[PDB]
Short mmCIF file of C-alpha atoms and ligand atoms in Angstrom, two decimals:
data_model
loop_
_atom_site.label_atom_id
_atom_site.label_comp_id
_atom_site.label_asym_id
_atom_site.label_seq_id
_atom_site.Cartn_x
_atom_site.Cartn_y
_atom_site.Cartn_z
CA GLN A 23 23.86 65.90 28.09
CA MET A 24 21.71 65.64 31.22
CA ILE A 25 18.49 64.87 29.34
CA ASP A 26 18.46 63.97 25.67
CA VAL A 27 15.35 63.01 23.71
CA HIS A 28 15.04 62.38 19.95
CA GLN A 29 11.79 62.09 17.95
CA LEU A 30 9.95 60.64 20.94
CA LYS A 31 6.53 59.16 20.14
CA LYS A 32 3.98 57.47 22.34
CA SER A 33 0.40 56.32 21.68
CA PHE A 34 -2.41 54.92 23.80
CA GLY A 35 -4.06 52.57 21.31
CA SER A 36 -4.57 54.48 18.05
CA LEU A 37 -4.35 57.87 19.73
CA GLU A 38 -0.92 59.40 19.23
CA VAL A 39 -0.17 61.45 22.39
CA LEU A 40 3.43 62.45 21.67
CA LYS A 41 4.06 62.91 17.95
CA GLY A 42 7.83 63.31 17.80
CA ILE A 43 9.34 65.25 20.68
CA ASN A 44 12.83 66.73 20.55
CA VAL A 45 14.39 67.98 23.79
CA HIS A 46 17.94 68.45 25.01
CA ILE A 47 18.39 69.65 28.57
CA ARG A 48 21.80 70.15 30.11
CA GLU A 49 22.73 69.97 33.78
CA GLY A 50 21.67 73.04 35.77
CA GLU A 51 19.02 74.06 33.28
CA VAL A 52 15.55 74.81 34.58
CA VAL A 53 12.98 74.02 31.87
CA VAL A 54 9.34 75.07 32.30
CA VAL A 55 6.68 73.33 30.20
CA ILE A 56 3.33 74.95 29.42
CA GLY A 57 0.31 74.01 27.31
CA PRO A 58 -3.33 72.86 27.40
CA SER A 59 -4.48 69.56 28.88
CA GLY A 60 -4.05 66.58 26.61
CA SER A 61 -0.78 67.84 25.08
CA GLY A 62 1.23 65.00 26.62
CA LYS A 63 3.06 67.09 29.20
CA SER A 64 2.54 64.57 32.00
CA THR A 65 3.11 61.63 29.62
CA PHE A 66 6.38 63.24 28.62
CA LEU A 67 7.48 63.52 32.27
CA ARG A 68 6.28 60.02 33.04
CA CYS A 69 8.50 58.71 30.22
CA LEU A 70 11.56 60.47 31.64
CA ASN A 71 10.79 58.88 34.99
CA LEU A 72 10.41 55.35 33.60
CA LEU A 73 6.82 55.32 34.85
CA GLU A 74 5.55 54.97 31.30
CA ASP A 75 7.09 53.35 28.20
CA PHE A 76 7.44 54.94 24.76
CA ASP A 77 6.95 53.66 21.21
CA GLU A 78 9.48 55.43 18.98
CA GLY A 79 12.53 57.66 19.21
CA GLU A 80 14.76 57.46 22.24
CA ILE A 81 15.73 58.91 25.61
CA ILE A 82 19.14 59.31 27.28
CA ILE A 83 19.20 60.40 30.91
CA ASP A 84 22.73 61.47 31.85
CA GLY A 85 24.31 59.05 29.37
CA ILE A 86 22.24 55.97 30.11
CA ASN A 87 19.99 55.10 27.15
CA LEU A 88 16.55 53.94 28.31
CA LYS A 89 15.73 51.39 25.61
CA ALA A 90 19.24 50.00 25.17
CA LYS A 91 19.93 46.59 26.64
CA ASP A 92 22.49 46.46 29.44
CA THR A 93 21.74 49.86 30.99
CA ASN A 94 20.08 49.00 34.36
CA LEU A 95 16.82 50.92 34.62
CA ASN A 96 16.62 51.14 38.42
CA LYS A 97 19.85 53.16 38.55
CA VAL A 98 18.41 55.91 36.37
CA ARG A 99 15.15 55.72 38.29
CA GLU A 100 16.86 56.79 41.49
CA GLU A 101 18.75 59.86 40.25
CA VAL A 102 15.50 61.34 38.94
CA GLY A 103 13.04 62.63 41.53
CA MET A 104 9.42 63.56 40.88
CA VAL A 105 6.70 65.68 42.50
CA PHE A 106 3.12 65.31 41.32
CA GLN A 107 0.11 67.66 41.34
CA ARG A 108 -1.44 65.61 44.07
CA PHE A 109 -0.53 62.99 46.66
CA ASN A 110 3.18 62.13 47.08
CA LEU A 111 2.78 61.04 50.72
CA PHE A 112 1.92 57.86 52.63
CA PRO A 113 -1.04 58.80 54.81
CA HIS A 114 -0.39 55.85 57.13
CA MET A 115 3.10 56.90 58.24
CA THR A 116 4.76 59.94 59.79
CA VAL A 117 6.31 62.73 57.78
CA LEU A 118 9.73 61.49 58.87
CA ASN A 119 9.07 57.86 57.85
CA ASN A 120 7.72 59.12 54.50
CA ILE A 121 11.11 60.69 53.80
CA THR A 122 13.42 57.84 54.93
CA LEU A 123 11.56 54.89 53.35
CA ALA A 124 13.27 54.99 49.94
CA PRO A 125 16.75 55.99 51.24
CA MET A 126 16.79 52.99 53.62
CA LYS A 127 15.22 50.40 51.36
CA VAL A 128 17.00 51.52 48.17
CA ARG A 129 20.28 52.90 49.55
CA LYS A 130 20.49 50.61 52.59
CA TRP A 131 21.19 53.58 54.86
CA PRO A 132 20.98 52.84 58.60
CA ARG A 133 17.86 54.46 60.11
CA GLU A 134 19.89 56.93 62.18
CA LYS A 135 21.67 58.27 59.12
CA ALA A 136 18.55 58.41 56.96
CA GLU A 137 16.70 60.29 59.71
CA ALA A 138 19.51 62.79 60.37
CA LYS A 139 19.39 63.67 56.69
CA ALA A 140 15.59 63.70 56.64
CA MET A 141 15.59 66.11 59.58
CA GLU A 142 18.01 68.32 57.69
CA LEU A 143 15.82 68.39 54.58
CA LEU A 144 12.68 68.94 56.63
CA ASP A 145 14.46 71.83 58.32
CA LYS A 146 15.45 73.34 55.00
CA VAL A 147 11.77 73.46 53.94
CA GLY A 148 10.77 74.94 57.27
CA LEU A 149 9.02 71.87 58.65
CA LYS A 150 11.46 70.06 60.93
CA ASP A 151 8.79 70.24 63.65
CA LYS A 152 6.36 68.18 61.52
CA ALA A 153 8.71 65.18 61.61
CA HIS A 154 6.51 62.94 63.76
CA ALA A 155 3.16 64.23 62.58
CA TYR A 156 1.03 62.32 60.12
CA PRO A 157 0.16 63.81 56.69
CA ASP A 158 -3.48 64.51 57.63
CA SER A 159 -2.51 67.40 59.96
CA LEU A 160 -0.55 69.18 57.25
CA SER A 161 -1.90 71.93 55.06
CA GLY A 162 -1.60 71.75 51.27
CA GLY A 163 1.46 73.95 51.25
CA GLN A 164 3.27 71.92 53.92
CA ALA A 165 2.30 68.55 52.41
CA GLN A 166 3.72 69.50 49.03
CA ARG A 167 6.93 70.75 50.69
CA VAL A 168 7.25 67.39 52.48
CA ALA A 169 6.66 65.67 49.12
CA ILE A 170 9.59 67.63 47.71
CA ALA A 171 11.70 66.76 50.75
CA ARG A 172 10.93 63.11 50.14
CA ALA A 173 11.96 63.19 46.49
CA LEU A 174 15.10 65.13 47.44
CA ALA A 175 16.04 62.60 50.16
CA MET A 176 17.16 60.17 47.41
CA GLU A 177 19.61 62.85 46.30
CA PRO A 178 18.56 62.91 42.60
CA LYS A 179 20.39 64.84 39.85
CA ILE A 180 17.16 65.65 38.03
CA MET A 181 13.94 66.92 39.57
CA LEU A 182 10.66 66.63 37.67
CA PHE A 183 7.57 68.62 38.71
CA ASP A 184 4.12 68.04 37.29
CA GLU A 185 2.02 71.09 38.20
CA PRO A 186 3.14 70.90 41.88
CA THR A 187 1.01 73.89 42.94
CA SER A 188 -1.93 73.89 40.54
CA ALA A 189 -4.19 72.15 43.07
CA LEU A 190 -3.21 74.48 45.96
CA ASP A 191 -5.09 77.47 47.35
CA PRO A 192 -3.35 80.63 46.09
CA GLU A 193 -2.13 81.37 49.63
CA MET A 194 -0.22 78.06 49.69
CA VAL A 195 1.48 78.44 46.31
CA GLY A 196 4.28 80.75 47.40
CA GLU A 197 5.78 78.56 50.14
CA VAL A 198 6.00 75.76 47.57
CA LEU A 199 7.42 77.87 44.75
CA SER A 200 10.12 79.26 47.11
CA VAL A 201 11.54 75.77 47.74
CA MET A 202 11.57 75.19 43.97
CA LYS A 203 13.44 78.44 43.35
CA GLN A 204 16.05 77.52 45.96
CA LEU A 205 16.35 74.15 44.28
CA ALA A 206 16.79 76.11 41.04
CA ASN A 207 19.22 78.61 42.55
CA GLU A 208 21.30 75.66 43.71
CA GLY A 209 21.92 74.33 40.21
CA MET A 210 19.54 71.34 40.11
CA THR A 211 18.40 70.14 36.68
CA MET A 212 14.66 70.74 36.64
CA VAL A 213 11.76 70.10 34.30
CA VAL A 214 8.66 71.86 35.61
CA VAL A 215 5.19 71.61 34.11
CA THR A 216 3.55 74.74 35.57
CA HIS A 217 1.36 77.69 34.62
CA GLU A 218 2.85 79.95 37.32
CA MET A 219 4.20 82.72 35.08
CA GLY A 220 6.11 84.35 37.93
CA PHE A 221 8.21 81.27 38.68
CA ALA A 222 8.96 80.77 34.97
CA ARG A 223 10.24 84.34 34.55
CA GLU A 224 12.39 84.31 37.67
CA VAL A 225 14.28 81.00 37.48
CA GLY A 226 13.25 79.34 34.26
CA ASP A 227 16.06 79.13 31.73
CA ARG A 228 13.78 78.11 28.90
CA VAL A 229 10.05 77.55 28.31
CA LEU A 230 8.68 74.86 26.00
CA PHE A 231 5.11 75.18 24.80
CA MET A 232 3.45 71.83 24.10
CA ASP A 233 0.23 71.46 22.17
CA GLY A 234 -1.44 68.55 20.41
CA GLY A 235 1.50 66.24 21.03
CA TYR A 236 4.23 68.56 19.72
CA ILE A 237 6.56 71.22 21.07
CA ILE A 238 5.13 74.10 19.05
CA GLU A 239 7.61 76.74 20.28
CA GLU A 240 10.56 77.36 22.64
CA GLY A 241 12.34 80.34 24.10
CA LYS A 242 13.69 82.29 27.03
CA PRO A 243 10.79 82.92 29.50
CA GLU A 244 10.16 86.59 28.69
CA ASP A 245 10.61 86.07 24.94
CA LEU A 246 7.90 83.41 24.78
CA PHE A 247 5.49 85.00 27.24
CA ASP A 248 5.81 88.56 25.92
CA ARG A 249 6.85 88.02 22.29
CA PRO A 250 5.22 84.72 21.27
CA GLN A 251 6.25 83.92 17.69
CA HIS A 252 3.79 81.13 16.85
CA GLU A 253 0.07 81.73 16.42
CA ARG A 254 -0.86 78.73 18.61
CA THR A 255 1.31 79.96 21.45
CA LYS A 256 -0.39 83.40 21.41
CA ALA A 257 -3.85 81.79 21.44
CA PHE A 258 -3.00 79.55 24.36
CA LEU A 259 -1.29 82.32 26.33
CA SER A 260 -4.36 84.55 26.01
CA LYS A 261 -6.46 81.80 27.60
CA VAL A 262 -4.28 81.69 30.66
CA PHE A 263 -2.40 84.92 31.36
CA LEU B 22 -18.75 36.60 68.17
CA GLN B 23 -18.03 40.35 68.02
CA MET B 24 -15.89 41.99 65.31
CA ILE B 25 -13.92 44.61 67.26
CA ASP B 26 -13.26 44.29 70.96
CA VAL B 27 -11.39 46.99 72.91
CA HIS B 28 -10.97 46.76 76.70
CA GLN B 29 -9.66 49.91 78.42
CA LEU B 30 -7.35 50.83 75.54
CA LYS B 31 -4.71 53.37 76.49
CA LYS B 32 -2.15 55.11 74.32
CA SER B 33 0.60 57.57 75.11
CA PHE B 34 3.12 59.37 72.96
CA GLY B 35 5.92 59.77 75.44
CA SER B 36 4.44 61.27 78.61
CA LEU B 37 1.50 62.64 76.66
CA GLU B 38 -1.62 60.48 76.99
CA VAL B 39 -3.69 60.49 73.78
CA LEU B 40 -6.22 57.71 74.51
CA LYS B 41 -7.10 57.94 78.21
CA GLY B 42 -8.63 54.45 78.26
CA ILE B 43 -11.63 53.69 76.06
CA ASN B 44 -13.91 50.68 75.78
CA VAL B 45 -15.59 49.59 72.58
CA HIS B 46 -17.34 46.52 71.27
CA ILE B 47 -18.46 46.34 67.67
CA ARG B 48 -20.21 43.30 66.26
CA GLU B 49 -20.34 42.03 62.70
CA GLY B 50 -22.52 44.28 60.57
CA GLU B 51 -22.25 47.39 62.74
CA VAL B 52 -21.65 50.93 61.51
CA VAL B 53 -20.19 52.99 64.32
CA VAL B 54 -19.67 56.70 63.72
CA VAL B 55 -16.99 58.43 65.74
CA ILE B 56 -17.31 62.19 66.17
CA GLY B 57 -15.43 64.72 68.24
CA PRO B 58 -13.18 67.80 68.27
CA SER B 59 -9.71 67.64 66.75
CA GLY B 60 -7.09 66.32 69.09
CA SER B 61 -9.29 63.78 70.81
CA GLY B 62 -7.59 60.65 69.58
CA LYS B 63 -10.04 59.73 66.85
CA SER B 64 -7.22 59.09 64.34
CA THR B 65 -4.85 57.45 66.85
CA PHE B 66 -7.70 55.10 67.68
CA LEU B 67 -8.18 54.08 64.03
CA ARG B 68 -4.44 53.52 63.49
CA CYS B 69 -4.50 51.16 66.49
CA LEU B 70 -7.33 49.08 65.04
CA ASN B 71 -5.43 48.95 61.73
CA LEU B 72 -2.10 47.86 63.29
CA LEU B 73 -0.72 51.19 62.05
CA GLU B 74 0.24 52.12 65.57
CA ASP B 75 1.05 50.53 68.91
CA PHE B 76 -0.98 50.79 72.12
CA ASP B 77 0.26 50.69 75.72
CA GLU B 78 -2.49 49.09 77.84
CA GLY B 79 -5.79 47.35 77.33
CA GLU B 80 -6.39 44.71 74.72
CA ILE B 81 -7.72 44.64 71.16
CA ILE B 82 -9.20 41.70 69.24
CA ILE B 83 -10.09 41.91 65.54
CA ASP B 84 -12.29 38.97 64.55
CA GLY B 85 -11.00 36.56 67.18
CA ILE B 86 -7.37 37.58 66.64
CA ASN B 87 -5.95 39.37 69.70
CA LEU B 88 -3.76 42.00 68.03
CA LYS B 89 -0.82 41.50 70.41
CA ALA B 90 -1.01 37.73 70.88
CA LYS B 91 2.29 35.81 70.77
CA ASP B 92 2.25 33.49 67.75
CA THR B 93 0.99 36.27 65.51
CA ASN B 94 -1.92 35.98 63.11
CA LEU B 95 -1.75 39.75 62.66
CA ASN B 96 -1.06 40.36 58.96
CA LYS B 97 -4.16 38.41 58.13
CA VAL B 98 -5.80 41.22 60.09
CA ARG B 99 -4.13 43.76 57.82
CA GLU B 100 -5.81 42.07 54.86
CA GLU B 101 -9.15 42.05 56.69
CA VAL B 102 -8.94 45.66 57.80
CA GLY B 103 -9.26 48.18 55.01
CA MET B 104 -8.88 51.92 55.56
CA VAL B 105 -9.46 55.17 53.69
CA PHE B 106 -7.87 58.39 54.82
CA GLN B 107 -8.80 62.04 54.50
CA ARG B 108 -6.06 62.65 51.96
CA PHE B 109 -3.23 60.84 50.21
CA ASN B 110 -5.10 57.65 49.28
CA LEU B 111 -3.58 56.95 45.86
CA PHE B 112 -0.20 56.54 44.16
CA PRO B 113 0.04 59.34 41.54
CA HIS B 114 2.85 57.51 39.70
CA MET B 115 0.46 54.80 38.49
CA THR B 116 -2.99 54.47 36.95
CA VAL B 117 -6.29 54.05 38.79
CA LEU B 118 -6.53 50.39 37.82
CA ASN B 119 -2.96 49.71 38.90
CA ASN B 120 -3.57 51.36 42.30
CA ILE B 121 -6.42 48.94 43.01
CA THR B 122 -4.61 45.75 41.91
CA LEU B 123 -1.29 46.47 43.63
CA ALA B 124 -2.14 44.78 46.95
CA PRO B 125 -4.35 41.87 45.81
CA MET B 126 -1.65 40.76 43.37
CA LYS B 127 1.25 41.38 45.75
CA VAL B 128 -0.27 40.30 49.07
CA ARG B 129 -2.72 37.65 47.87
CA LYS B 130 -0.95 36.45 44.72
CA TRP B 131 -3.96 37.18 42.51
CA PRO B 132 -3.34 36.73 38.76
CA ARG B 133 -3.22 39.97 36.79
CA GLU B 134 -6.30 38.87 34.84
CA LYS B 135 -8.29 38.12 37.99
CA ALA B 136 -7.17 41.24 39.90
CA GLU B 137 -8.01 43.61 37.07
CA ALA B 138 -11.39 41.90 36.58
CA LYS B 139 -12.71 42.55 40.09
CA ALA B 140 -11.07 45.98 40.01
CA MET B 141 -13.08 47.02 36.97
CA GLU B 142 -16.27 45.90 38.65
CA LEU B 143 -15.47 47.87 41.80
CA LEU B 144 -14.76 50.94 39.69
CA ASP B 145 -18.15 50.35 38.09
CA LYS B 146 -19.53 50.03 41.64
CA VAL B 147 -18.39 53.59 42.39
CA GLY B 148 -19.41 54.96 39.00
CA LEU B 149 -15.90 55.22 37.57
CA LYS B 150 -15.06 52.31 35.25
CA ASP B 151 -13.94 54.58 32.40
CA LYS B 152 -11.30 56.09 34.69
CA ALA B 153 -9.56 52.72 34.97
CA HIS B 154 -6.71 53.93 32.76
CA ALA B 155 -6.55 57.51 33.99
CA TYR B 156 -3.95 58.88 36.38
CA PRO B 157 -4.76 60.33 39.84
CA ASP B 158 -3.63 63.87 38.90
CA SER B 159 -6.70 64.03 36.60
CA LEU B 160 -9.44 63.03 39.07
CA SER B 161 -11.60 65.26 41.23
CA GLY B 162 -11.58 64.93 45.00
CA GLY B 163 -14.89 63.12 44.92
CA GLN B 164 -13.62 60.70 42.29
CA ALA B 165 -10.21 60.25 43.87
CA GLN B 166 -11.87 59.37 47.17
CA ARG B 167 -14.30 56.94 45.51
CA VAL B 168 -11.29 55.25 43.89
CA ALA B 169 -9.44 55.15 47.23
CA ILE B 170 -12.46 53.26 48.58
CA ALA B 171 -12.48 50.89 45.63
CA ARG B 172 -8.81 50.30 46.32
CA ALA B 173 -9.29 49.31 49.96
CA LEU B 174 -12.22 47.10 48.96
CA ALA B 175 -10.05 45.29 46.42
CA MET B 176 -8.63 43.36 49.36
CA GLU B 177 -12.11 42.10 50.26
CA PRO B 178 -11.80 43.21 53.89
CA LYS B 179 -14.09 42.29 56.78
CA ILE B 180 -13.79 45.74 58.37
CA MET B 181 -13.65 49.21 56.73
CA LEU B 182 -12.14 52.17 58.60
CA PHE B 183 -12.82 55.70 57.34
CA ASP B 184 -10.91 58.67 58.74
CA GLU B 185 -12.83 61.79 57.71
CA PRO B 186 -12.94 60.74 54.03
CA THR B 187 -14.75 63.94 52.98
CA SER B 188 -13.38 66.62 55.34
CA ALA B 189 -11.03 67.85 52.63
CA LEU B 190 -13.61 67.92 49.84
CA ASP B 191 -15.58 70.83 48.38
CA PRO B 192 -19.23 70.73 49.52
CA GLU B 193 -20.19 69.60 46.00
CA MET B 194 -18.11 66.41 46.01
CA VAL B 195 -18.85 65.34 49.57
CA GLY B 196 -22.08 63.65 48.46
CA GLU B 197 -20.79 61.13 45.92
CA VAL B 198 -18.37 59.70 48.50
CA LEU B 199 -20.91 59.51 51.35
CA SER B 200 -23.20 57.79 48.84
CA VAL B 201 -20.62 55.08 48.21
CA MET B 202 -20.28 54.64 51.99
CA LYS B 203 -24.06 54.63 52.32
CA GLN B 204 -24.06 51.68 49.96
CA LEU B 205 -21.33 49.77 51.79
CA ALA B 206 -23.37 50.16 54.98
CA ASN B 207 -26.61 48.77 53.46
CA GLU B 208 -24.67 45.68 52.37
CA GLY B 209 -23.76 44.88 55.97
CA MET B 210 -20.09 45.92 55.95
CA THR B 211 -18.68 46.41 59.46
CA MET B 212 -17.56 50.05 59.57
CA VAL B 213 -15.95 52.57 61.89
CA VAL B 214 -16.31 56.06 60.48
CA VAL B 215 -14.75 59.21 61.88
CA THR B 216 -16.73 62.11 60.34
CA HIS B 217 -18.40 65.43 60.91
CA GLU B 218 -21.08 64.70 58.30
CA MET B 219 -23.95 64.21 60.73
CA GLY B 220 -26.47 63.50 57.98
CA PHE B 221 -24.59 60.33 57.09
CA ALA B 222 -24.41 59.29 60.75
CA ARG B 223 -28.17 59.67 61.25
CA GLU B 224 -29.08 57.75 58.08
CA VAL B 225 -26.41 55.03 58.26
CA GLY B 226 -24.97 55.04 61.77
CA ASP B 227 -26.11 52.26 64.10
CA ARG B 228 -24.33 53.92 66.98
CA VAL B 229 -22.43 57.17 67.57
CA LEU B 230 -19.40 57.68 69.82
CA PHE B 231 -18.55 61.20 70.96
CA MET B 232 -14.83 61.44 71.76
CA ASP B 233 -13.29 64.33 73.66
CA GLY B 234 -9.75 64.53 75.01
CA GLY B 235 -8.98 60.82 74.87
CA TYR B 236 -12.27 59.63 76.39
CA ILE B 237 -15.59 58.56 74.98
CA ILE B 238 -17.80 61.15 76.68
CA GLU B 239 -21.12 59.97 75.31
CA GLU B 240 -22.57 57.15 73.21
CA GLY B 241 -25.95 56.09 71.89
CA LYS B 242 -28.16 55.91 68.81
CA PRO B 243 -27.70 58.86 66.38
CA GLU B 244 -31.14 60.45 66.85
CA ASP B 245 -30.74 60.42 70.65
CA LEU B 246 -27.19 61.79 70.72
CA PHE B 247 -27.87 64.31 67.97
CA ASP B 248 -31.23 65.68 69.09
CA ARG B 249 -31.08 65.10 72.82
CA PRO B 250 -27.37 65.20 73.82
CA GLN B 251 -26.96 64.31 77.49
CA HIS B 252 -23.50 65.71 78.17
CA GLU B 253 -22.45 69.38 78.13
CA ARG B 254 -19.33 68.76 76.10
CA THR B 255 -21.42 66.81 73.61
CA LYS B 256 -23.77 69.80 73.42
CA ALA B 257 -20.85 72.22 73.11
CA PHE B 258 -19.22 70.36 70.26
CA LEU B 259 -22.52 69.83 68.45
CA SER B 260 -23.19 73.58 68.71
CA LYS B 261 -20.38 74.33 66.23
CA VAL B 262 -22.48 74.66 63.03
CA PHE B 263 -25.43 73.32 65.04
N1 ADP C 1 -3.57 54.71 29.48
C1 ADP C 1 -4.22 55.53 28.65
N2 ADP C 1 -5.06 55.04 27.72
C2 ADP C 1 -5.69 55.85 26.89
N3 ADP C 1 -5.53 57.16 26.93
C3 ADP C 1 -4.70 57.73 27.83
C4 ADP C 1 -4.02 56.91 28.73
N4 ADP C 1 -3.28 57.69 29.49
C5 ADP C 1 -3.48 58.95 29.10
N5 ADP C 1 -4.33 58.97 28.09
C6 ADP C 1 -4.76 60.16 27.34
O1 ADP C 1 -3.76 60.56 26.38
C7 ADP C 1 -3.48 61.95 26.58
C8 ADP C 1 -2.35 62.10 27.59
O2 ADP C 1 -2.24 63.46 27.98
P1 ADP C 1 -1.21 63.98 29.09
O3 ADP C 1 0.08 63.24 29.14
O4 ADP C 1 -1.98 63.90 30.50
O5 ADP C 1 -0.96 65.53 28.74
P2 ADP C 1 -1.33 66.71 29.75
O6 ADP C 1 -0.35 66.54 31.01
O7 ADP C 1 -0.83 68.07 29.02
O8 ADP C 1 -2.77 66.78 30.12
C9 ADP C 1 -4.74 62.48 27.25
O9 ADP C 1 -5.82 62.50 26.31
C10 ADP C 1 -4.95 61.38 28.26
O10 ADP C 1 -6.30 61.40 28.75
N1 ADP C 2 3.69 61.52 67.52
C1 ADP C 2 3.01 62.28 68.38
N2 ADP C 2 3.60 62.79 69.45
C2 ADP C 2 2.94 63.53 70.32
N3 ADP C 2 1.65 63.79 70.18
C3 ADP C 2 0.97 63.30 69.12
C4 ADP C 2 1.65 62.52 68.18
N4 ADP C 2 0.77 62.17 67.26
C5 ADP C 2 -0.40 62.70 67.59
N5 ADP C 2 -0.30 63.38 68.72
C6 ADP C 2 -1.39 64.07 69.44
O1 ADP C 2 -2.37 63.14 69.90
C7 ADP C 2 -3.58 63.88 70.12
C8 ADP C 2 -4.72 63.19 69.38
O2 ADP C 2 -4.45 63.05 67.99
P1 ADP C 2 -5.56 62.37 67.02
O3 ADP C 2 -5.69 60.91 67.23
O4 ADP C 2 -5.10 62.73 65.52
O5 ADP C 2 -6.93 63.16 67.32
P2 ADP C 2 -8.00 63.52 66.15
O6 ADP C 2 -7.75 62.14 65.33
O7 ADP C 2 -9.28 63.40 67.11
O8 ADP C 2 -7.46 64.83 65.73
C9 ADP C 2 -3.34 65.27 69.52
O9 ADP C 2 -2.85 66.14 70.54
C10 ADP C 2 -2.22 64.97 68.52
O10 ADP C 2 -1.49 66.17 68.25
MG1 MG C 3 -1.51 65.82 32.89
MG1 MG C 4 -7.55 63.08 63.02
#
């Protein structure tokens, strides 16, 4: 009941990007999403984060129905964090200020409280000493960890990841995946669009393969990667792994 | 008149002096390149000019306005001073087009129709009008940085600050960005550019400032400072990838 989607459809003009998506993710589940570009993976995530609107079907995030009147969108918005492939940081402010901005403005937390918690989070990602540094001095691996710390600072119940390490140098991937695994080990509800097989196998509860606007196949990590049942899945897997 | 005026500017982070007192005067139309080793205060200096950070001593005046003058007119400076960073220039949670129109609409009350109109032209100006409806996660470094520029220009600023806009790009994409900056320069835009791309400096730089440890060690026209450096430290820094 954490994330419930029924026959979701979305189009950009006369190009149908999502052609009827069905997904039901319960609290604590870690769902990995794979598939070629153009399959609507990001669009799907963007819909769950209220960053994009959808045409048909419906979405229910932890009870609250997104297209129902009443509701209150901004409440859902804040219990769902998101980490993108790139960016995620204000280059004009310190690491610390990047993390406390939303908790102060949206949760009206006094600066001292927000910072004490930011420091804690920064410490848990191994970067407490980067607190007063600006984003430019950080490496790709540190920057993405700060970006996760920032999304976590709002204390969300759902964490969305859109290829968080695909743009990183191989050496930087690990430090980022580790934080994600800890987040997984700690029971967070996660949806992760990634092509990092290792991560999927270790903490992924289920893998959904998206292609051409549909979820072509599902399964436990090793079942889908090693025993793909659909022809399209096998073809795509052999182009990546 | 003089666009940027900086009398013995000093900055300290606690008991650690970053800018040991520097003097700079940039007039309307000037392209000043700032080079120097890391940890010399190049970035701190830019953040001061862009009200992003506070300075201890000296004074600063951006187009008449004295940055720390009582009955403030400094948020009209913010709209006149545009800046592009090395990384993190765009919001990934929104489209290209929406990144560019966010400030004009918000800060200057521009009507959605108007804002998106000039935005499309700017995108065209950087060779990316078809990316108007794309998301940042799909662009290349070169493109992303050309869009970041278009974004800052959306506010029609008087001054453009660039903090190593290509230092994080693959050699292949460095060119398209410098080219967009080359263009801004030809059009008479007042610019302060921190870079290590000496070719750009030579071709577009009116003046070059060599910073080292919080001080401006050497100044002068590009060709003179590049070919015939007068100071040892300037020679030493320029010897790294000669
Ligand atoms: N605003 C838009 N207008 C038109 N087409 C769009 C728009 N946004 C995205 N698209 C296109 O629709 C499809 C969306 O794909 P996407 O959600 O990015 O899936 P993926 O994350 O697997 O690449 C792609 O073809 C994308 O380029
Ligand atoms: N918040 C801070 N506290 C202490 N030192 C800082 C802080 N921010 C920057 N510095 C230091 O100021 C010095 C100059 O930084 P900077 O302006 O970024 O130089 P460059 O831009 O030439 O690398 C460096 O030693 C940098 O680490
Ligand atoms: Mg995508
Ligand atoms: Mg710097």
